[PDB]
Every structure is written in C-alpha cells, then in structure tokens.
Amino acid sequence: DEAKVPAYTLPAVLALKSGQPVTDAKSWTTKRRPEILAIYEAEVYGKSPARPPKLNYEVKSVEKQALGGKATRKIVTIFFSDKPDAPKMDLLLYLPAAAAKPAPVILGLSFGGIHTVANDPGVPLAEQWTRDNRKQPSAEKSRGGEASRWQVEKILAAGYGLATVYYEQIEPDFAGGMKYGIRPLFFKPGQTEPEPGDWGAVAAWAWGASRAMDYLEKDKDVDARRVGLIGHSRLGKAAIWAGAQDARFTFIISNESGEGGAAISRRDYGERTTALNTRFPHWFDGNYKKYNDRENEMPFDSHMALALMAPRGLYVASAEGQWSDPKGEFLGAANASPVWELFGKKGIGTMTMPDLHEPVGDSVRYHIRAGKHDVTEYDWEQYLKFAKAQWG
C-alpha cells in the first residue's frame, strides 16, 4: 500500500558533503564521485585489497562445436593463492562458433556451479553448498538447472559470449563461511578477523568478478572493450559495487537487487537493513550495522551507489511478485539518472513508474515484469537489446 510508505528527503547526489554543488562532469569525476565511493567503502561494503599485480590462472579445457556445434567452450581456473586447497574459482566461457572476430562477452555471477548454466554434458559437475551449510558434489540431475536464468542460446544467437563463475567459490554464503573464502588471505600478520571498515562478503564477490575480468582481457577470442556484468538478487548488489570499483565493465545489469542494491532505503524505517545484517551478518562490513533500524541516519541512499556507474550503462529490473520493492528500485535508478546528463547521455527519462512489460530509458534502463523473483526469458530479451545499444 503506497499511502503507507514514509516520505523523506534524499541526500543530494549532486551536492558535496560541504554543501557546495557539483557543477559539471569534471567536478563529479574529481570531487563528488571519490567522496561517494569513500562513503560506501567505509560504511557499507568495506575496503577491498588492490588488484593483484599478476593473475595466476590456467586454461584447463577448450572444446569446439560444444552446445551442438553452436559454441566454443573454455574452462579456466583462477587461483587466489599459490597455496594448496586454497580458494580458487572456475570460469566457464561460451563463445559463438561462427565468430569472425573477438567477440563481446556478458560476464555473470552464478548462484550454481558451472554445470547448471547450460545443458552441456562436457562440463564437470561442481561441488555446491547446501541448505545445511555443507559442501558436496552435485548430482547429474542438476545439470542445466539454472539454464533458464542464463538463456545462452539467445546470447550466442546475438553474436555474444557468456562467462559465468559460481559465487560461493569466492566466499560461501552463510554466516561462518568467511574462513573458507578469500578474505582471510589478506589479513595483516596476526589479524583474527576483519576490522569494521574492511570488506564484507558482497565486496568479496565483487572483487572476484573483477578477477574474472582480468582473465577475459587476456583471452584473444574476447573483445576486452565489450564486456558487461550481470547479477541477480544479492549478486545484483555485488554487481553494483563491482561496476563502481571497476571501470572496465561497459555496463552492469542488476536484477531485483533490493536493500544495499538499487532499492531506496528510506522507503522503510531501517528494518530491511536490520533483517539483512542479522540474518546475513557476513554481507556488509561492521560499520554498516550501526544503521539498523535508523539508530543512525545513513549519509547516503541507493541512487548515489547507482550513480557510480555513470556514464556507463546501467539496467535495473524488478518482478511484480513479495519481499521486494520494485518501485523503490525504479526510484533508485530515476534519482541517479541526473548524473548521466552531466556527460551528455540520457538516463531513465521519467519519474513515473512504468506498468508491466514496458521498458523505459536509454543509458539507464528499467522494467518491471510479471512473475516471481527470478531471471526469465523476457528479461534477457530486453538485456540483449540494451547490450546492442551499448556496444553498437
């Protein structure tokens, strides 16, 4: 019920903390954007390490005519650490078989192992984490189980490749899972746990997407100028911050990403933040918890986080049907859009929430669709049109 939504005044994305106004793109790039990035690094997602000077990886597998002659398939292992039994991740890549040149790639963070992304028997079954917080090999019945969320046939049809990484290889997603992930790798000598401004798990997943990018820009069959990033749900939060931190993504797609993602926090009284920091204490850094239930007012809201993409592409999307707030995510994008105008680009183009199946916008796009929390065939149809507008 929209009459029950509190009203509020958003922090001004185009004013500095002093109150001085941001007057042009120069001033955004040199003054305001660094200040917004610093705010979110300290109070929300946490400080991450710098880019590793050298990527340690191995191309484990390269096959032709995969997917019924439709694709070239690779599988690449990226090591976060020389040690043994150390954290590492398996990047799956499908490039179109007919590719005459290095091809654009959509990179994605996946909720399942690489065997869930297509119905491809050449792909080894991956060990996944379960409802009981155990890790164990996946059953063959699970192959292609996420296939409808990735629609690889449409992507190749459009002339593009798809790259995916299973996110829990970077850090498993349950409270207590940090010890199995990359964050312990960067502790100071005799450091037991993260300081309250250090990266949390969302930040860790984002940092992994950027190491996937490190590899994509070495692969001669990939157009390193034409990579984008997609994430769903909690991984849409990750994708927002990876986009903020990593200028190489020409666009990000953030599908139904909620609180700490695209959604405007001030549309409730801090209860989503508490629920998240309570149930998922690993997601955000220790400073974020002071904002629970408005015990402190946030010196930010989500339109500022989304503006960290400007002037690159941004697609926000929602589903009609729950525990989500689609209009909150629309208003995230619409209130970030002024920043794209500083650069001569077009944003959402409206402040009125559209109806079902009516995509709006140019460099910032939005749609709401029927159905449940998911990624569907309808979504990818609009995403691949976005991608064409973004890539030429």
Side-chain angles (χ1 to χ4, degrees):
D1 204 43
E2 188 76 13
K4 301 292 207 246
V5 174
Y8 50 82
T9 320
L10 299 178
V13 67
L14 286 170
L16 297 162
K17 208 183 143 182
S18 51
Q20 162 192 343
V22 180
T23 66
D24 52 15
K26 185 208 280 90
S27 179
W28 175 261
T29 297
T30 53
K31 299 180 192 140
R32 184 55 173 154
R33 192 192 185 274
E35 168 170 84
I36 290 182
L37 196 70
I39 292 165
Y40 273 97
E41 177 184 278
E43 306 293 310
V44 186
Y45 305 106
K47 179 51 118 174
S48 300
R51 185 183 174 186
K54 59 185 61 145
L55 197 75
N56 185 205
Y57 72 101
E58 171 169 63
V59 178
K60 285 223 195 291
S61 166
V62 185
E63 189 162 295
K64 297 279 167 160
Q65 317 267 286
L67 299 182
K70 277 175 261 139
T72 296
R73 184 220 310 124
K74 317 184 182 192
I75 300 168
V76 187
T77 302
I78 297 176
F79 306 88
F80 297 127
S81 189
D82 65 358
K83 307 309 170 192
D85 272 359
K88 78 197 186 83
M89 65 181 178
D90 304 313
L91 184 55
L92 168 71
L93 179 62
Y94 295 113
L95 296 163
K101 51 184 293 208
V105 167
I106 309 178
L107 174 75
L109 298 150
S110 184
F111 281 96
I114 39 162
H115 66 279
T116 64
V117 175
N119 214 303
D120 183 2
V123 169
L125 294 176
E127 304 197 311
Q128 286 179 219
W129 293 82
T130 75
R131 196 199 61 107
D132 295 293
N133 305 343
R134 301 165 202 151
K135 186 188 75 219
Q136 69 192 30
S138 281
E140 165 65 29
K141 183 68 180 94
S142 75
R143 188 172 301 271
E146 286 289 88
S148 67
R149 284 89 197 185
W150 293 107
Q151 298 288 333
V152 61
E153 293 91 22
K154 268 168 162 73
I155 301 174
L156 304 162
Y160 311 143
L162 170 65
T164 48
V165 283
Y166 172 39
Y167 78 118
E168 290 183 290
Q169 312 200 302
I170 297 143
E171 175 172 327
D173 185 9
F174 59 85
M178 170 190 105
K179 72 173 305 191
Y180 308 106
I182 61 161
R183 284 199 282 149
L185 304 177
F186 290 86
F187 282 166
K188 199 171 174 294
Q191 196 189 343
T192 318
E193 91 195 70
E195 277 305 272
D198 282 353
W199 53 350
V202 170
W205 302 324
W207 195 85
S210 286
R211 316 292 58 99
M213 181 71 215
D214 291 350
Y215 171 77
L216 287 175
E217 66 174 14
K218 300 170 173 197
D219 182 303
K220 96 189 170 294
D221 304 325
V222 163
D223 180 350
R225 305 293 163 100
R226 291 188 177 82
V227 186
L229 176 66
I230 187 169
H232 170 61
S233 199
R234 70 195 71 175
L235 296 177
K237 304 180 213 298
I240 284 167
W241 186 242
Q245 302 259 280
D246 186 343
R248 290 171 304 178
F249 298 122
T250 57
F251 62 76
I252 70 141
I253 299 179
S254 184
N255 188 278
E256 329 179 2
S257 62
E259 169 70 282
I264 292 287
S265 174
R266 283 167 169 78
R267 271 176 64 85
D268 75 349
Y269 311 99
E271 300 99 331
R272 281 168 306 170
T273 283
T274 290
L276 290 187
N277 282 325
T278 286
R279 165 162 15 164
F280 302 111
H282 55 294
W283 283 9
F284 306 95
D285 74 5
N287 289 324
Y288 194 59
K289 323 294 198 264
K290 67 220 221 200
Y291 302 106
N292 288 340
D293 277 304
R294 302 296 177 233
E295 260 150 43
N296 298 266
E297 198 185 8
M298 297 170 166
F300 54 80
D301 217 325
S302 71
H303 63 305
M304 288 158 65
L306 298 168
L308 301 170
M309 285 312 293
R312 299 171 278 142
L314 167 70
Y315 206 132
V316 175
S318 305
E320 170 197 56
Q322 39 136 334
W323 331 98
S324 67
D325 186 12
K327 172 140 134 185
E329 299 196 33
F330 169 73
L331 291 163
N335 279 283
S337 276
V339 184
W340 273 258
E341 288 191 50
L342 294 182
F343 287 92
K345 293 288 184 176
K346 270 167 163 236
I348 281 295
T350 183
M351 293 285 322
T352 77
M353 176 81 180
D355 200 354
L356 303 179
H357 303 129
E358 306 192 0
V360 294
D362 287 293
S363 273
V364 184
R365 301 191 184 194
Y366 177 88
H367 68 252
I368 173 161
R369 59 151 174 88
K372 67 136 185 167
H373 195 53
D374 208 355
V375 191
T376 78
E377 192 183 314
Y378 176 87
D379 295 317
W380 271 108
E381 282 160 22
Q382 324 315 137
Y383 299 158
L384 288 175
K385 292 187 140 144
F386 183 62
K388 177 155 88 93
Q390 285 282 300
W391 282 340

